[PDB]
Amino acid sequence: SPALPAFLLCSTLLVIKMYVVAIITGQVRLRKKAFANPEDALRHGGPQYCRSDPDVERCLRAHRNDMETIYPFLFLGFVYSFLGPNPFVAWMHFLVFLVGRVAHTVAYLGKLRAPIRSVTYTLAQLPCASMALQILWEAARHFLPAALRAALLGRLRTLRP
Amino acid sequence: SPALPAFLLCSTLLVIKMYVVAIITGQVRLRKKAFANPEDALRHGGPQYCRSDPDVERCLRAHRNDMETIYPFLFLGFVYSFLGPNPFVAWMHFLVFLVGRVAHTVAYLGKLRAPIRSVTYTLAQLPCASMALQILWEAARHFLPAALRAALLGRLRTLRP
Amino acid sequence: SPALPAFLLCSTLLVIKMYVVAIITGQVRLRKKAFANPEDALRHGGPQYCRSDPDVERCLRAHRNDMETIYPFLFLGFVYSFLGPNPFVAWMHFLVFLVGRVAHTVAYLGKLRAPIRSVTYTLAQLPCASMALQILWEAARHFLPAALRAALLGRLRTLRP
Numbered sequence A, B, C: 001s002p003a004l005p006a007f008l009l010c011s012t013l014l015v016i017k018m019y020v021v022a023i024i025t026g027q028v029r030l031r032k033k034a035f036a037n038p039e040d041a042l043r044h045g046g047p048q049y050c051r052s053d054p055d056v057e058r059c060l061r062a063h064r065n066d067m068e069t070i071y072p073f074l075f076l077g078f079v080y081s082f083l084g085p086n087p088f089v090a091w092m093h094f095l096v097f098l099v100g101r102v103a104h105t106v107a108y109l110g111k112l113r114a115p116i117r118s119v120t121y122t123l124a125q126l127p128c129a130s131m132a133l134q135i136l137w138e139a140a141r142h143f144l145p146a147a148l149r150a151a152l153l154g155r156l157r158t159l160r161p
C-alpha cells in the first residue's frame, strides 16, 4: 500500500490543523472574555464574562464542520488506501482534501465573502464521495454470486466432465 | 475476516447517509433562509437572514447525534471484525445498527411522536455495546497471567523434571 | 504490535465513558425536564418543557469536547501502535490520555474550580501531540530521497564498478 504513507501525512496534518482551530478558539475566548462556564468566568474577571461572542461561535462552527468532514476522511481514506488505487490518483484525492479543508478554515475564520467557503466545502467533499463509492463498489463486488464474478473474469462454467 | 466486507458496506452507507443529512441541512438553510453567517445572508437576501430556524436546528441535532453514535461504530466495528466473530452474528450486529440509525434519522427529520426516535437510538446502541464488551473482554484476556490462561485451556504446570 | 492491546483497552474504555456521558445527559433532561424537541416535551408534561437548561448544556459541552479529543486519539493511537514504539512508553501515552480525559469529565460535570478542567484538557493533549509528531516524522521519513536515507544508515554510494 504505497498510498498509505501519503494518507498518513495528509490525515495527521488535518488533525493538527484541527488542534490549531481548538487553540485559536481558546485564545478568542480569552481576548473577547467570553467563557462557556461560570467557573471559568470567575477566574478571568467575574460572572459577566460567562457569555457568548460571535467570534467564539464562529470558531466552534469551523471546528464542528471539521468534525463532520475530516473524521469521515480518516476512515474512508484509510480503507481506500488498502484498495490498491493508482498512487498518483490517491495522492490527488488526499491533496484535494487537505488543501480544500485548509482553505475552508481560512474562509471561515477569515470571514471571506460568500460563497467562497461554501465552494471549498463542496470541492473537498469531491474526493471523499469518490473514495466512498469506490469502497462501496469493492464491498459490493465481494457479495456477487460466484458465477457472475467468474463470467466477468472470462470464465463460464464447463459442461465437460 | 469474512465479517470485514459486510462492515465496510454498512459503515460506508452510514457515512453517505451522514453526507445526506448534511445536504438536507443546507437545503433547509436555503428554503427557510436561515444562515449561520453574516457573509452568507448577504449573498442570499440581506442581514436579516442571518438567523436561526427550528428546522435547521433539528437537522444539526440529527447530524450531531450521528457523530456521537456512528463515529464510535466505525472504530468498534472495525476492530470487532478482526476478532473472528461468527459471520451471521456479525452481520446482525451491523444490520441492527444500520437499520437503527437510518430509522433514527427518519424519526428525527420526520418529527415522529415520542418516544419513537428515543427507542431507535437505544436499539441501535445495543450491538455497539455488545462489540465494545467483546473487544474489552479480548483486550483483557491478553493481560491475564499466563498460568491462568493455560489453566483455562486445560494445562496445569508439570512438576515432572 | 505489543502496544495494540493496551490501546484497545484504553480506547474502548473511553468510548464507554462517552456512552456514559450520553446516558447522564438524557437523565439530566428527564429530571430537569428540558427537552430539545416539541414531540419529546409532549410525552413528558407539555410544550413548556421544550426548553434549554444549564446542566443539559454542560453535558453537551462535555460530550462535544470528547468528540474533539477522543476521536482523534482513536485514529492517532491506532496508527501509532503499529509504529513499534517502546511498550512502556506507549502504555504511558495511553494512560496519560485515559486518566486525563476521565479527569476532564469529572471536572466538567462536577463543576470544579477554574482552571482545573482546562489543565486536564492540556495534559491529556500532550501524548496526542507526541503521537502525531511521531506519525508525521515516520510518514515524512518515507518520502526522503533514497540517497539521504542510505547516508543516515551509514551507506554512501560506491564509485567502485
Ligand SMILES: Cn1c(Nc2c(Cl)ccc(CNC(=O)C(C)(C)C)c2Cl)nc2cc(C(=O)NCC(F)(F)F)c(OCC(C)(C)O)cc21
Residues within 6 Å of the ligand: A022, A023, A025, A026, A027, A029, A030, A035, A039, A040, A041, A043, C114, C115, C118, C119, C120, C121, C122, C123
Ligand atoms: C488560567 N488557566 C486557564 N484558563 C482558561 C479557562 Cl479557565 C477557560 C478557558 C481557557 C481557554 N483555553 C485555552 O486557551 C486552551 C489553550 C486551554 C485551549 C482558559 Cl486559558 N487555562 C489554563 C491552562 C493551564 C495549563 O494547561 N497549563 C499547562 C499544564 F497543563 F501543563 F500545566 C494553566 O496552567 C497554570 C499552571 C500554573 C498550572 O501552569 C492555567 C490556565
Ligand SMILES: Cn1c(Nc2c(Cl)ccc(CNC(=O)C(C)(C)C)c2Cl)nc2cc(C(=O)NCC(F)(F)F)c(OCC(C)(C)O)cc21
Residues within 6 Å of the ligand: A114, A115, A118, A119, A120, A121, A122, A123, B022, B023, B025, B026, B027, B029, B030, B035, B039, B040, B041, B043
Ligand atoms: C451561492 N452558493 C452557495 N450558497 C450557500 C451559502 Cl453562501 C451558505 C449556505 C449554503 C447551503 N449549503 C448547501 O446547501 C451545501 C450543498 C453546500 C451543503 C449555500 Cl448553498 N453555496 C454554493 C456552492 C457552490 C458550489 O459548491 N459549486 C460547485 C463547485 F464547488 F464545484 F464549484 C456554488 O457554485 C457556484 C459556481 C458558479 C462556482 O458554480 C455557489 C454556491
Ligand SMILES: Cn1c(Nc2c(Cl)ccc(CNC(=O)C(C)(C)C)c2Cl)nc2cc(C(=O)NCC(F)(F)F)c(OCC(C)(C)O)cc21
Residues within 6 Å of the ligand: B114, B115, B118, B119, B120, B121, B122, B123, C022, C023, C025, C026, C027, C029, C030, C035, C039, C040, C041, C043
Ligand atoms: C418514554 N421514553 C423515552 N423518553 C425520552 C424522550 Cl421522549 C426524550 C429524551 C429522553 C432521554 N434519553 C435518555 O435518557 C436515553 C437513555 C435514551 C439516552 C427520554 Cl428518556 N425514551 C424511551 C426509551 C425507551 C427504550 O429505549 N426502551 C428500551 C428498548 F429500546 F429496548 F425498547 C422506552 O421504552 C418503552 C418501552 C415500552 C418500549 O419499553 C421509552 C422511552
Ligand SMILES: N[C@@H](CCC(=O)N[C@@H](CS)C(=O)NCC(=O)O)C(=O)O
Residues within 6 Å of the ligand: A061, A062, A064, A065, A068, A117, A118, A119, A121, A122, B022, B023, B025, B026, B036, B060, B063
Ligand atoms: N452542519 C452544516 C451542514 C452543511 C455544510 O457542511 N455546509 C458547508 C458549506 S455551506 C459549511 O461550510 N457549513 C458551515 C458550518 O457548518 O458552519 C451546516 O450547518 O451548514
Ligand SMILES: N[C@@H](CCC(=O)N[C@@H](CS)C(=O)NCC(=O)O)C(=O)O
Residues within 6 Å of the ligand: B061, B062, B064, B065, B068, B117, B118, B119, B121, B122, C022, C023, C025, C026, C036, C060, C063
Ligand atoms: N447528545 C444527546 C445524548 C443522549 C442521546 O443520544 N439521546 C438520544 C435518544 S433520546 C437522541 O435521540 N438524542 C437526540 C439528540 O441528540 O438531539 C442529547 O442531547 O440527547
Ligand SMILES: N[C@@H](CCC(=O)N[C@@H](CS)C(=O)NCC(=O)O)C(=O)O
Residues within 6 Å of the ligand: A022, A023, A025, A026, A036, A060, A063, C061, C062, C064, C065, C068, C117, C118, C119, C121, C122
Ligand atoms: N471547543 C473548545 C476548544 C478549546 C478546548 O478544548 N478547551 C478545553 C480547555 S479550556 C475545554 O475544556 N473546553 C471546554 C469545552 O469545549 O466546553 C471550546 O469551545 O473551549
